Each structure stands twice: as structure tokens, then as C-alpha cells.
């Protein structure tokens, strides 16, 4: 009497990518405004120069009024604007 055992535990893999590269501009939730704030607050003054510059390009009122003290208002800022802050800070934190 000899013995052999057999079994095939076949589990499916998963790989998914977005088809487009469009400005999704989804309704940015309250917490994602905070998520930018903490992660931008840890960026050096050099990066803070570009961080505000894109906001001042969106808000020409604050651009012209104050080139010295700049208040980034995330809550009213457009999800298309904050898209740049998100992808940029993420590119500073991660090698991406």
C-alpha cells in the first residue's frame, strides 16, 4: 500500500488601473482639507512658497493683497486646486 495526496487551492489575483487621467474633481470631504493641512504644515518654507503660489493663482485677490502673509482656505478651495496640493505633498512624502 502506497499513498499520494492532491489538492488545487486556486485563488484569483487582482490588478486594476483607472482608464483616464481626467480632473476627477470629486466633492472633497471635510477631513481631506485637514489631511492636506497637517502634511503641508510639515513641508519646509521652500515648498510652502509653491504651495501658496498655486493658491494665489486661484485666488488673485489674496495674491495682490498679501505677498508676505498668505492664508490658504482649504474648505472653500476647489477640489481641482487641492488635487495639486494632494498629488504634490504625496510626491514629497513618497518617491512618486
Amino acid at each position: 500500500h502506497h499513498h499520494h495526496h492532491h489538492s488545487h487551492m486556486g485563488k484569483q489575483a487582482s490588478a486594476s488601473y483607472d482608464s483616464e487621467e481626467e480632473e476627477e474633481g470629486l466633492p472633497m470631504s471635510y477631513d481631506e482639507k485637514r489631511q492636506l493641512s497637517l502634511d503641508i504644515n510639515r513641508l519646509p518654507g521652500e515648498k510652502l512658497g509653491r504651495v501658496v503660489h498655486i493658491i494665489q493663482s486661484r485666488e488673485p485677490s489674496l495674491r495682490d493683497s498679501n505677498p508676505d502673509e498668505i492664508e490658504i482656505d482649504f474648505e472653500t478651495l476647489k477640489p481641482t486646486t487641492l488635487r495639486e496640493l494632494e498629488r504634490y505633498v504625496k510626491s514629497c512624502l513618497q518617491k512618486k
Binding site: 482639507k33 493641512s37 508676505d68 502673509e69 492664508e71 490658504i72
Partner: peptide, 23 residues
């Protein structure tokens, strides 16, 4: 280059003023 500012929280966690600081 410039006088080094700091990013500071303006009341709300959704507002940050980069105040005019000396390096």
C-alpha cells in the same frame, strides 16, 4: 533669498496663515 516664514493654523484646521517671521 527671503525671510523664512512659518505655516501657522488660523483658527480652523482648514485655514493656515504663513506669518511674516524673521529667520
Amino acid at each position: 533669498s527671503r525671510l523664512t516664514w512659518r505655516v501657522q493654523r488660523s483658527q480652523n484646521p482648514l485655514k493656515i496663515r504663513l506669518t511674516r517671521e524673521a529667520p
